[PDB]
Enzyme design. Structure first.
Site, PDB file in Angstrom:
ATOM      1  N   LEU A 102       0.717  -1.270   0.041  1.00 51.70           N
ATOM      2  CA  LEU A 102       0.036  -0.093  -0.011  1.00 51.70           C
ATOM      3  C   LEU A 102       0.835   1.356   0.135  1.00 51.70           C
ATOM      4  CD1 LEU A 102      -1.783  -2.446   1.268  1.00 51.70           C
ATOM      5  CD2 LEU A 102      -2.936  -0.506   2.363  1.00 51.70           C
ATOM      6  N   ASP A 103       0.912   2.023  -1.093  1.00 56.09           N
ATOM      7  CA  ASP A 103       1.719   3.320  -1.238  1.00 56.09           C
ATOM      8  C   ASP A 103       0.839   4.131  -1.888  1.00 56.09           C
ATOM      9  OD1 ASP A 103       3.518   5.492  -1.042  1.00 56.09           O
ATOM     10  OD2 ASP A 103       4.256   4.494  -2.819  1.00 56.09           O
ATOM     11  N   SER A 104       0.034   5.068  -1.177  1.00 54.49           N
ATOM     12  CA  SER A 104      -0.796   6.235  -1.778  1.00 54.49           C
ATOM     13  C   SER A 104      -0.133   7.203  -2.510  1.00 54.49           C
ATOM     14  CB  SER A 104      -1.709   6.713  -0.693  1.00 54.49           C
ATOM     15  OG  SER A 104      -0.921   7.384   0.312  1.00 54.49           O
TER      16      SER A 104
END
Lengths: 380, 380
Positions: free
Chosen positions: A265-267
């Site tokens: 998860l890496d916005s």
């Protein structure tokens, strides 16, 4: 939610991939090339279908958005800085007034002599990477994000080499860590964990809300779950790594699939990423057109062949529909869209969920329990 | 030369590669695609330089021009036909009134019953090839090309299958052989040789004059050397094959070369041809741009890197300069040209000299001595 929240929330700005692409298109005057190439594709005159995807950029950092904000302050005199968020680092970094580099000259600086709350540490520290090298020292002062404040040990940077032409062109001064990875060996808790340690917040958790209809904006909420961002339940997945926002999931794009994938998860990542082989199978006979010489995959907005993307856990499936992974290019060609999905080989069987995913899913990052949470974002 | 010649001359019309390309560009509305792609090339944005030449058409017949004329007649009643010239066949071919195929319905027919000079032969004959199949029978009658006439055995065609969509779309009825290869085993001399046999002409020779400034026109002269077509001497080369207009030459395009090449003279071929490997070396770092998805190599008219093409014999070098192997595309993009040179693998080390070569060199084809002759064409 955003008008008088329960827990401390800050807005941040995003320079995204759409914006950079439009800049490149204006710069090089590419609109008509793209339009004329698409017309060619639609006439059935590009064939049989060739492979020009390499274009091995590859770099995950070619895909990074800049998530920035200017409301964080250091010291009792509240020295102002513009910070970008980094989801893997657990440190805060700022330019020192003693920075000898040319990079630092136009930037806001930390000056330990002007703050009554500074406590010396002086432990030297150094990052070296392909993109560039930063050396500095640890210093302790008050780090304030609006409502939240805590004495905290950050890195004062004395020499910065590389990270150009971006750093000099950007208004960003430093980096604010929303991750797990500390450069020290002195077990410096993330800013968020330290807030909890000092009883500034109830829990060491934060959330990212990316509003569906403003792709230049996001919101970071610290210290609790703000339920007015999302509909339905929060589902939780366990991290499969001690120091990354990473989980175990089975990935299916239509008939193309990969079991026990590592999914980060890496916005701040601008797109969805998949392995290259996986991608090729996906786009084959899916009527997507690679524009020659540009890193750009395009198709009609109503493409009836494009499948739902599925990320399966043992008790929940997260999905993305075509409308969440396509970006309209109406200013180039009526009903044209681009794919926000890029092939890139990382660690084997590793996938990244970037901005497109988080425009649908409100996400929660829980240092206390080593979990990430997902829920259907509201449209605010 | 062309106003009251010494030896019999006939004009013929040419549908060339430029014409076909422009048709394709109008049909598929490709002008702006080509323009926008070139602009991309000029900005340095196509890279490093990729290989999209395959596009293995390959076929030598994809490159054939149609050289046609309508002044030849069969029989004492002078039955009119439109013939294309074929430089490898030694037969004359026409549709029979008895042709059962649909192809023949819109065509001029030979009707042996209407000619007092017909002599029956009836020997059956058949060509089968990839492009199509023709069966018919030999018949004897007067074959007249204006000033020249001789009783001659030609092929009356009773069934024609294939050669579409061209044959039905063309105004051409049959084929008039300016070559050596007879389908019979009855040793039927070429029309030109038979004229000499019967003392209709001094010598079994003909020449092709292709005027430099009319690419839709050529002139065929039979029975002697008309010196007003050319400047300086005629040089002769010996045929290296009993039944082809083919010679031994060393080919050099700049630093790219090939010794003891077979070089076929065929004015009906629309371009210069070279082997594929040879071509790739030639275009590499020569600043020529392959337009994606089209069989089209383009460059600026003034390209200072393009070399002279050299075809070397033991006592003469024939050359082509860039201005003779480039075709202006001013109606697409100012100062843009295309290469009239195509890669194609034939027989090993075999090259073809088509229309571009013959726009510079007046050429002579000498059945009596088994030679071809070359001289600098005048600009008439």
């Amino acid at each position: 939610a955003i008008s008088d929240p329960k827990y401390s929330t800050v807005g941040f700005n995003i320079e995204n991939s759409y914006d950079r692409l439009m800049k490149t298109i204006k710069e090089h005057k590419l609109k008509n090339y793209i339009k004329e190439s698409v017309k060619l594709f639609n006439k059935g005159l590009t064939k049989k279908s060739y492979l020009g995807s390499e274009f091995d950029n590859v770099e995950l950092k070619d895909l990074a958005n800049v998530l920035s904000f200017g409301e964080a302050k250091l010291g009792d005199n509240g020295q102002k800085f513009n910070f970008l968020f980094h989801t893997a680092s657990s440190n805060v970094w700022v330019p020192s007034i003693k920075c000898t580099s040319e990079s630092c000259e136009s930037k806001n600086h930390y000056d330990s002599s002007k703050s009554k709350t500074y406590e010396k540490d002086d432990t030297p520290v150094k990052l070296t990477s392909k993109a560039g090298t930063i050396s500095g020292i640890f210093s302790k002062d008050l780090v304030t994000i609006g409502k939240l404040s805590v004495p905290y040990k950050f890195i004062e940077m004395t020499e910065i080499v590389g990270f150009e032409p971006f750093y000099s062109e950007s208004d960003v001064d430093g980096v604010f860590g929303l991750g797990w990875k500390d450069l020290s060996i002195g077990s410096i808790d993330p800013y968020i964990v330290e807030l909890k340690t000092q009883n500034k917040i109830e829990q060491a958790v934060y959330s990212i809300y990316l509003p569906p209809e403003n792709k230049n904006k996001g919101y970071l909420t610290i210290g609790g779950i703000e339920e007015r961002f999302f509909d339905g339940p929060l589902n939780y997945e366990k991290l499969n790594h001690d120091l990354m926002w990473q989980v175990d999931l089975d990935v299916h794009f239509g008939n193309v699939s990969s079991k026990k994938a590592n999914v980060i998860l890496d916005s701040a990542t601008s797109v969805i990423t998949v392995p290259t082989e996986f991608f090729n199978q996906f786009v084959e006979s899916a009527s997507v057109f690679k524009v020659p010489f540009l890193s750009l995959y395009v198709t009609t907005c109503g493409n009836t062949k494009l499948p739902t993307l599925e990320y399966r856990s043992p008790n929940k499936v997260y999905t993305l529909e075509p409308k969440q992974y396509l970006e309209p290019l109406e200013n180039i060609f009526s009903a044209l869209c681009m794919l926000n999905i890029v092939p890139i080989d990382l660690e084997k069987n590793t996938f990244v969920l970037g901005d497109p995913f988080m425009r649908k899913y409100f996400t929660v990052y829980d240092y206390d329990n080593h979990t990430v949470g997902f829920a259907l974002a509201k449209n605010l």
